[PDB]
């Protein structure tokens, strides 16, 4: 694990505590209001794996503290008109996704929802790789490959083959709901790690600031307190790469 | 304004709804628990403007939704031993600051708190500027300048010269509390804007993903659904500058 044991356990608990929503009722509106209080929500690709060829049977969204499964098959367009569309189309919250290409296609052509304002962790991995290796790799990384690489999770964490027929059977099984929740549970976290890893020069510049006065002897420190309109002398080399 | 009118009004409300804490009591523990639920908290530089030369009379911390003013002059080290130290020295939450140089100095030498894990918006404006202009500027930007530049706020938003004598008199005046709260109110939002503006290639790569399949005709779209281990054909061009 590259995440803490504490944080891992907290996410595992979140994975078990999902809320399933299959009517536009008070729990729906409470979910929509919680999603709208966040800077970032995560959206799973589960349910959109055929792009524009098929409607989504469900839509999995989370905050950093709570996972929601919306039963799109049963609520139909009502779930979108009652708040999900504005969430997905709006600037805020930003949507975290891992490879939103098919999600975007499915939402637009099957649900009339134009996804906008996304943090894509697959794109982030490509940016981190380019920053390090100068050129892009020839292939992209799966969500599970990223969860292993960035968080240290075991290789089998994501259930990648949900069965298309069971996903459309109702009542929706507990086994499928539990898989959907586990498959989204680490995505919020992944995004925070990838965002930091994208910004290595920035973070070196921060570390220069945090130390610049604090580590100096008194006379030096007092001289620097009078020169705060200036960049620290070691800053340019710090952020260099 | 470069922020929405709605968001502006939300932040001005937060600025008025601060909580003042001057004893290690139930409100204090409530605040520490709230701050520890967050990915990011902000920390104002107000109170630390002489670095190591003087103790902080107050410490102002905020979440995205709530401002807290802690009376360090009255609580003294109890406030740090009761939860503030671990917050400020821990990896999580990350602390947003604008120019943490003196804050870091004061916290360590006057309060035995080693600030760690910071997102510094002054550093972030430097990174943005270097990205755009190739080289670093010859001066740094104040918090007020960055608020105007990035959020569109008016020039006099920050009260940059708190009255030293009223800052150490108790009861702490409403005028000083109100200033302290106004001076931190916009810092969380500033950090979110600066974080996005640091990452322009990333965001163009994201827009490439959102459009790649969605904008294609059906034939192309379906071919692309069979080639998701590959990078979109225009992605390099998108992320190039
Ligand atoms: Gd988080
Ligand atoms: Gd309370
Ligand atoms: Gd925010």
In the block, tokens 């892009």 appear at A136
Closest ligand to residue B28's CA: 2
Q: Which residue has the tokens 């708040």?
A: A83
β-strands B67-70, B94-97 pairing: unpaired
**Exposed/middle/buried for residue B236 (C-beta within 10 Å: 0-12, 13-18, 19+):** middle
- Other C-beta atoms closer than 10 Å to the C-beta of A171 total 8
| Nearest in space to A19 (alpha carbons), one of A33, A30, A7 | A30
Measured CA angle at A48 (ends A47, A54), to 5 deg:
100
- Three-state SS at B53: helix
| CA triple A43-A45-A47, angle to 5 deg | 110
d(CA B199, CA A198): 8
Q: Which ligand is nearest to the CA of B65?
A: 3
What spacing in Å lies between the alpha carbon of A42 and ligand 1's midpoint? 11
Axis crossing angle, helix B101-111 with helix A200-212, rounded to the nearest 10:
50
**Residue partners of A179: CB distance under 8 A and separation at least 6:** A159, A162
CA of A64 from ligand 1 middle (Å) equals 5
Q: Directed axis angle between helix B200-212 and helix A121-133, to 10°?
A: 130
Q: How many CA atoms lie within 13 A of A123 on its CB side?
A: 26
What Å distances lie between residue A43 and A51, B45, B110, B224, CA to CA? 15, 36, 45, 21
Of A65, A118, A195, nearest to B210 by CB-CB distance is A118
Q: Let me know: does B128 contact B194? Beta carbons within 8 Å.
A: yes
Strand order in the sheet with B118-120: B19-21, B67-70, B59-62, B40-43, B94-97, B118-120
Shortest CA distance to A38 belongs to which of A117, A93, A90?
A93
Residues 6+ apart with CB under 8 A from A205: A235, A238, A239, B120, B123, B126, B127
* C-alpha span between B88 and B86 (Å, rounded): 6
Alpha-carbon distance of A194 to A124, in angstroms, equals: 6
The data reach a resolution, in angstroms, of 1.6
Whether the CB-CB separation of A56 and A106 falls below 8 Å is answered with: yes
d(CA B140, CA A190): 32
Q: Please, what's the largest Cα pairwise distance for chain B?
A: 74
Contact A148, A27 (CB under 8 A): no
Which residue, A43, A161, A66, is CA-closest to A113?
Answer: A43
Q: What is the DSSP code (8-state) at residue B96? A: E
Which residues 162-191 of B are in CB contact (within 8 Å) with A? none
Q: Using CA atoms, how far apart are residues A59 and A160, in angstroms rounded to an integer?
A: 16
**A162 close to A176: Cβ distance less than 8 angstroms:** yes
How far apart, in Å, are the Cα atoms of A152 and each of A144, A190, A199, B33, B173?
A: 10, 11, 20, 28, 50
């Amino acid at each position: 694990l590259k995440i803490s044991q504490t944080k891992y356990e907290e996410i595992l608990k979140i994975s078990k505590k999902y809320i399933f929503i299959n009517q536009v009722d008070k729990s729906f509106h409470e979910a929509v209001d919680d999603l709208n209080q966040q800077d970032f929500i995560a959206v799973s690709g589960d349910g959109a794996n055929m792009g524009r060829k098929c409607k989504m049977p469900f839509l999995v969204l989370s905050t950093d503290h709570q996972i929601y499964i919306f039963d799109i098959q049963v609520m139909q367009y009502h779930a979108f008109e009652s708040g999900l569309k504005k969430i997905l189309e709006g600037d805020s919250p930003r949507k975290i996704a891992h490879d939103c290409r098919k999600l975007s296609d499915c939402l637009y052509h099957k649900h009339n929802v134009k996804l906008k304002s996304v943090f894509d962790t697959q794109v982030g991995d490509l940016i981190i790789t380019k920053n390090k290796k100068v050129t892009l790799p020839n292939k992209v990384k799966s969500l599970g490959e990223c969860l292993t690489n960035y968080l240290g999770l075991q290789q089998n964490t994501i259930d990648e083959k949900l069965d298309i027929v069971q996903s459309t059977e109702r009542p929706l099984s507990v086994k499928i709901k539990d898989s959907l929740a586990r498959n989204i549970a680490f995505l919020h976290h992944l995004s925070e790690v990838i965002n930091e890893e994208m910004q290595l020069p920035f973070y070196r510049g921060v570390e220069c600031y945090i130390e610049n006065i604090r580590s100096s002897d008194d006379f030096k420190a007092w001289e620097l307190c009078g020169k705060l309109n200036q960049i620290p002398k070691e800053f340019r080399n710090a952020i260099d790469y």
